[PDB]
Design an enzyme around this catalytic site. Structure first.
Site, PDB file in Angstrom:
ATOM      1  N   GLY A   1      37.182  51.927  51.561  1.00  0.00           N
ATOM      2  CA  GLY A   1      37.179  53.012  50.533  1.00  0.00           C
ATOM      3  C   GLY A   1      37.559  52.459  49.134  1.00  0.00           C
TER       4      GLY A   1
ATOM      5  N   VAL B   1      39.723  53.682  45.125  1.00  0.00           N
ATOM      6  CA  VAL B   1      40.922  54.445  44.597  1.00  0.00           C
ATOM      7  C   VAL B   1      40.801  55.119  43.405  1.00  0.00           C
ATOM      8  CG1 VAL B   1      43.512  54.059  44.443  1.00  0.00           C
ATOM      9  CG2 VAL B   1      42.236  53.152  46.436  1.00  0.00           C
TER      10      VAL B   1
ATOM     11  N   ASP C   1      45.609  41.933  54.906  1.00  0.00           N
ATOM     12  CA  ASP C   1      44.909  41.439  53.899  1.00  0.00           C
ATOM     13  C   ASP C   1      45.747  41.391  52.644  1.00  0.00           C
ATOM     14  OD1 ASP C   1      42.475  40.995  52.272  1.00  0.00           O
ATOM     15  OD2 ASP C   1      41.790  43.172  52.155  1.00  0.00           O
TER      16      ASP C   1
HETATM   17  C1  LIG Z   1      48.787  52.870  36.733  1.00  0.00           C
HETATM   18  C2  LIG Z   1      47.807  51.493  37.038  1.00  0.00           C
HETATM   19  C3  LIG Z   1      47.437  51.389  38.410  1.00  0.00           C
HETATM   20  N1  LIG Z   1      48.094  51.921  39.550  1.00  0.00           N
HETATM   21  C4  LIG Z   1      47.926  51.976  40.735  1.00  0.00           C
HETATM   22  N2  LIG Z   1      48.374  52.565  41.667  1.00  0.00           N
HETATM   23  C5  LIG Z   1      47.887  52.522  42.934  1.00  0.00           C
HETATM   24  N3  LIG Z   1      48.616  53.412  44.066  1.00  0.00           N
HETATM   25  C6  LIG Z   1      46.920  51.763  43.629  1.00  0.00           C
HETATM   26  C7  LIG Z   1      46.117  51.623  44.641  1.00  0.00           C
HETATM   27  C8  LIG Z   1      46.710  52.106  45.886  1.00  0.00           C
HETATM   28  N4  LIG Z   1      46.872  52.371  47.024  1.00  0.00           N
HETATM   29  C9  LIG Z   1      45.120  50.658  44.195  1.00  0.00           C
HETATM   30  N5  LIG Z   1      44.171  49.932  45.264  1.00  0.00           N
HETATM   31  C10 LIG Z   1      42.783  49.588  44.583  1.00  0.00           C
HETATM   32  C11 LIG Z   1      42.110  49.561  46.060  1.00  0.00           C
HETATM   33  C12 LIG Z   1      43.243  48.865  47.051  1.00  0.00           C
HETATM   34  C13 LIG Z   1      44.440  49.468  46.602  1.00  0.00           C
HETATM   35  C14 LIG Z   1      45.660  48.800  46.628  1.00  0.00           C
HETATM   36  N6  LIG Z   1      45.140  50.281  42.806  1.00  0.00           N
HETATM   37  C15 LIG Z   1      44.436  49.481  42.363  1.00  0.00           C
HETATM   38  C16 LIG Z   1      46.043  50.880  42.603  1.00  0.00           C
HETATM   39  N7  LIG Z   1      46.642  50.968  41.306  1.00  0.00           N
HETATM   40  C17 LIG Z   1      46.506  50.170  38.380  1.00  0.00           C
HETATM   41  N8  LIG Z   1      46.397  50.002  37.326  1.00  0.00           N
HETATM   42  N9  LIG Z   1      47.020  50.864  36.267  1.00  0.00           N
HETATM   43  C18 LIG Z   1      47.031  51.042  35.198  1.00  0.00           C
HETATM   44  C19 LIG Z   1      46.874  49.399  34.291  1.00  0.00           C
HETATM   45  C20 LIG Z   1      45.366  49.471  34.116  1.00  0.00           C
HETATM   46  O1  LIG Z   1      44.768  50.649  34.708  1.00  0.00           O
HETATM   47  C21 LIG Z   1      45.729  51.684  34.398  1.00  0.00           C
END
Ligand SMILES: Cc1c(Nc2nc(N)c3c(C#N)c(N4CCC[C@H]4C)n(C)c3n2)cnn1[C@H]1CCOC1
Ligand SMILES: [Cl-]
Ligand SMILES: [Cl-]
Length: 261
Positions: free
Chosen positions: A17, A19, A120
């Site tokens: 999936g 996110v 993973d």
């Molecule tokens: C607030 C923020 C996040 N925050 C976040 N918060 C989550 N909860 C997930 C999450 C899950 N669950 C997830 N992913 C992607 C696919 C696997 C999974 C771990 N990703 C990637 C998640 N990223 C990532 N960048 N920024 C900022 C910096 C740049 O942009 C805005």
């Protein structure tokens, strides 16, 4: 509903999936929503997500299904991913690496303690809250390896080739825990060298043979101080029955070295 939540941006795509940063149309609360386009798999993922309660594991809020779409709600990690703190070809300061590795081991000890293997572990799946506390995320490959105090062996190949243990490529069945330990050692290498040591831990991969022949005068090993490298020699052991266990990682010299922020 398309009416309760605004999808502001993609945060990335998981094993099974993708996110989105969702903002509540009523309260403006910002969350992460996993959008599932199609099953037996999400039933299992939701069940494991409901088990999780630990400071170093992602907070699960709940789920909604609409047609061939299902929605999983999680705490938005305001610090983003560990992947984004790793400077290519550099890594990060050794004290930051050691703190993140302490927190990674605490999350993994918790998962293994409730009989769950992640399968993973990599920096894309390790998130950071606003105090830079690490959270193990993405339960899409997670499975039970212990139930009623009885271990079951894994028999499925999955994960991410540069992070997978060698037994996963070679053996019909293997123990869950040493696989997760291995991937944590590749994460530590990435944090300290800002590069992955090999495409996959197979004999047809020259970088893997080089490590088995102990050429630690080569990259990424020559960027790593002798103490954490000594831990990496005990983690990245080909035979899972000789690989260091987490209890012994907790006794490692580098793991226990006082380091300055
Ligand atoms: C607030 C923020 C996040 N925050 C976040 N918060 C989550 N909860 C997930 C999450 C899950 N669950 C997830 N992913 C992607 C696919 C696997 C999974 C771990 N990703 C990637 C998640 N990223 C990532 N960048 N920024 C900022 C910096 C740049 O942009 C805005
Ligand atoms: Cl890169
Ligand atoms: Cl990297």
């Amino acid at each position: 509903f398309v009416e309760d939540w605004d999808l502001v941006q993609t945060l990335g795509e998981g094993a099974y999936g993708e996110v989105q940063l969702a903002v509540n149309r009523v309260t403006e609360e910002a969350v992460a929503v996993k959008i599932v386009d199609m099953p037996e798999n999400i039933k299992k993922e939701i069940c494991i997500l409901k088990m999780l309660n630990h400071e170093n594991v992602i907070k699960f809020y709940g789920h909604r299904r609409e047609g061939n779409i299902q929605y999983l709600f999680m705490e938005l990690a305001s610090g983003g991913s560990l992947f984004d703190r790793i400077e290519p070809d550099i890594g990060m300061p050794e004290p930051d690496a050691q703190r993140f590795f302490h927190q990674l081991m605490a999350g993994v000890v918790y998962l293994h303690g409730i009989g769950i293997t992640h399968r993973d572990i990599k920096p894309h799946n390790l998130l950071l809250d606003e105090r830079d506390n690490l959270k193990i995320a993405d339960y899409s490959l997670a499975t039970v390896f212990r139930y009623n105090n009885r271990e079951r062996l894994l028999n499925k190949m999955c994960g991410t080739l540069p992070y997978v243990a060698p037994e996963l490529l070679k053996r019909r069945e293997f123990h869950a825990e040493p696989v997760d330990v291995w991937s944590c050692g590749i994460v530590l290498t990435a944090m300290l060298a800002g590069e992955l040591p090999w495409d996959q831990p197979s004999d047809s991969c020259q970088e893997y043979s080089d490590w088995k022949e102990k050429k630690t005068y080569l990259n990424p090993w020559k960027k790593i101080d002798s103490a954490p490298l000594a831990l990496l020699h005990k983690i990245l052991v080909e035979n899972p029955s000789a690989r260091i266990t987490i209890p012994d990682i907790k006794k490692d010299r580098w793991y226990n070295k006082p380091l300055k922020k």
